[PDB]
Amino acid sequence: EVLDGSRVHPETYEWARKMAVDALEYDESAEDANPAGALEEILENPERLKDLDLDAFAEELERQGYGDKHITLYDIRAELSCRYKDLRTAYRSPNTEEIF
Amino acid sequence: SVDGELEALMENGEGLSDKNQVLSLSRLMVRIETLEQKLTCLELIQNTHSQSCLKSFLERHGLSLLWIWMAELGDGRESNQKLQEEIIKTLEHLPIPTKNMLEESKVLPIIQRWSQTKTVDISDLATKLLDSWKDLKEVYRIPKKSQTEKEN
Numbered sequence: 001e002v003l004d005g006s007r008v009h010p011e012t013y014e015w016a017r018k019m020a021v022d023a024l025e026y027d028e029s030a031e032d033a034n035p036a037g038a039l040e041e042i043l044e045n046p047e048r049l050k051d052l053d054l055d056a057f058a059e060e061l062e063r064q065g066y067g068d069k070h071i072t073l074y075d076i077r078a079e080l081s082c083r084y085k086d087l088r089t090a091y092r093s094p095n096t097e098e099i100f
Numbered sequence: 101s102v103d104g105e106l107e108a109l110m111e112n113g114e115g116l117s118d119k120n121q122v123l124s125l126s127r128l129m130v131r132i133e134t135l136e137q138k139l140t141c142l143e144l145i146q147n148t149h150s151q152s153c154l155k156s157f158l159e160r161h162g163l164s165l166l167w168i169w170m171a172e173l174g175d176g177r178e179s180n181q182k183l184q185e186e187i188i189k190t191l192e193h194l195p196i197p198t199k200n201m202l203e204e205s206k207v208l209p210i211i212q213r214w215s216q217t218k219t220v221d222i223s224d225l226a227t228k229l230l231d232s233w234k235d236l237k238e239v240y241r242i243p244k245k246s247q248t249e250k251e252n
Contacts, residue, residue, distance in 0.1 A: 028239075050250035051250045052246055053242055060240050
C-alpha cells in the first residue's frame with residue numbers, strides 16, 4: 001500500500017506500478033512477481049527510475065485514450081525519487097534585517 | 101543419465117502431468133545435447149496436454165531452451181528438418197500468452213529465418229507458428245531508449 005505515502009493520486013497508481021516494474025525491467029514470467037515488490041525495490045534503488053523514455057509512455061497513454069499525461073508522469077518519477085518530498089524552502093536563520 | 105530420466109517422464113504417456121515432472125524436464129533440457137533427447141522432449145511436450153505444465157516449461161526458460169536447441173542446428177540443414185519438425189510442433193503446442201517472451205527468448209527471428217531457408221514441411225510449420233503470437237495479451241514497455249541522462 002506504499003504509494004499512500006506519496007503524491008501519486010489513486011488515479012495514477014496503476015501507471016506508477018507500471019513505471020516501477022519497467023524501470024527495474026522486473027520479472028514478468030508469473031503473477032507471483034507482484035508490483036509491490038518492485039515498488040519497495042525501486043524505492044530503495046531510485047537511479048533505475050531515472051533512465052526511462054516516459055515521453056513515449058505518455059504517448060501510449062494518449063493512445064489508450066487518457067489525453068496528455070507528460071507532466072503527470074514526470075511527477076510520478078519525482079515521487080518515487082523521493083516520496084512526499086516536502087517542498088517548503090529550506091529553513092534558514094532570520095536575516096539581520098529580519099532580526100532588526 | 102539424461103536419457104533414462106527423460107524416458108521415465110515418457111512412461112505415463114500423458115506428457116508432463118505435474119510441476120515436479122516439468123521441473124525435472126526443465127533440468128533435463130538444461131543437460132540435453134543429443135538429437136534423440138531433444139526429439140523426445142519435444143514429443144513429450146507435444147504429448148503434454150496439461151496447460152499449466154506447458155506454461156511452467158515456458159516459465160522455466162522453455163522458449164530459451166528451444167531457441168538454444170534451434171541455434172545448434174544452424175541457419176539451414178535438411179537432417180535438422182527432423183528436429184525442426186518436433187521443435188515447431190512443440191512451439192505450436194506451447195501456450196505463450198505474451199509477445200515480449202519471444203523477444204526475450206529470441207525464438208521468433210529463427211522461425212522467420214527458417215521459414216525463408218528452403219516429411220513435414222518446416223516452412224509450413226514455421227508459417228503456422230508466426231500468427232498465434234499476434235493475439236498476445238496487452239503489454240507495452242516504457243522504452244529505456246531515453247537520452248535524458250538519469251537526472252545526474
